[PDB]
Amino acid sequence: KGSVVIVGRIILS
Amino acid sequence: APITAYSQQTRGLLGCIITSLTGRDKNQVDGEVQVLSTATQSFLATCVNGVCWTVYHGAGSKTLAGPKGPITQMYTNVDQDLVGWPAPPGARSMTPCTCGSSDLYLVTRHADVIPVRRRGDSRGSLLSPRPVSYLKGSSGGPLLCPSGHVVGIFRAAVCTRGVAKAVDFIPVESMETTMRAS
Ligand SMILES: C=C[C@@H]1C[C@]1(NC(=O)[C@@H]1C[C@@H](Oc2cc(-c3csc(NC(=O)C(C)C)n3)nc3c(Br)c(OC)ccc23)CN1C(=O)[C@@H](NC(=O)OC1CCCC1)C(C)(C)C)C(=O)O
Ligand code: NA
């Protein structure tokens, strides 16, 4: 029942 | 290399455990790639045309914690190891590469950019080999052409004795097929 969680992000350039 | 990246963490151990249970994430979303976690594993999602795509061996059938509660997968293809959720609002949606370049760039969870040589539809050679441990946790990460468009997402590492010399990826073409079939 557990959700996947966003723990961070990556910014591109 | 042309393309560069950096990361920002948004949550820690406790907040992740809680958010996993409640399925509600109120954090503002940003970036082209989301760093994801479950109870056992970490992986990446690349957002392409309003959908954030990742691997089944990472997400299984799970929802993604969202601002309005859990988000149900929009696309689920166990045999291609591909799933996609509707992309949360602030997520920066990338554009599919259609010209197909020879030189590719793999973005890892560490926000390193690794040069790759395309070897076929879904395979790419590392120009210099890296430890497997270095790539672990980066499934779902984008392979980009120099222009910054997405050609595929990282699925599996080709390796021997803990050293990876190439990567297997899901081509954006596969994402087309799944969407159409649904
Ligand atoms: C080292 C990092 C690499 C990127 C990484 N990936 C991974 O860890 C992936 C996940 C798993 O590989 C696959 C799983 C599933 C899969 C589908 S469903 C499922 N699981 C379930 O249904 C469970 C509920 C049981 N697994 N489908 C695949 C498919 Br389709 C492929 O098609 C060409 C290729 C590999 C697949 C093993 N692996 C590998 O990278 C492994 N490599 C490997 O399998 O070699 C690849 C095969 C194609 C080219 C060479 C290894 C490094 C652990 C030895 C990661 O970080 O997770
Ligand atoms: Na970087």
- By Cβ distance, the residue of A4, A11, A12 closest to B64 is A4
Per domain, the residue ranges of chain B are: 7-94, 95-182
Resolution of the coordinates, Å: 1.9
Asked, colleague to colleague, whether B7-94 and B95-182 share their fold, the answer is yes
Q: Please give the CATH topology (third level) of the domain spanning B7-94.
A: Thrombin, subunit H (2.40.10)
Class of the CATH domain delimited by B95-182: mainly beta
In chain A, which residue's Cα lies nearest the Cα of B85? A4
Token output for B1: 């290399």
> Long-range CB contacts (< 8 A, 24+ apart) of B159-166?
B159/B132, B162/B131, B162/B132, B162/B133, B163/B129, B163/B130, B163/B131, B163/B132, B164/B126, B164/B129, B164/B130, B164/B131, B164/B132, B164/B134, B164/B135, B165/B125, B165/B126, B165/B129, B166/B119, B166/B123, B166/B124, B166/B125, B166/B126
b/e string for B113-134 if b means 16 or more Cβ within 10 A?
bbebebeeebbbbbeeebeeeb
User: Is B16 part of any known ligand binding site?
Assistant: no
Token output for B36: 């994801």
In chain B, which residue's Cα lies nearest the Cα of A11? B31
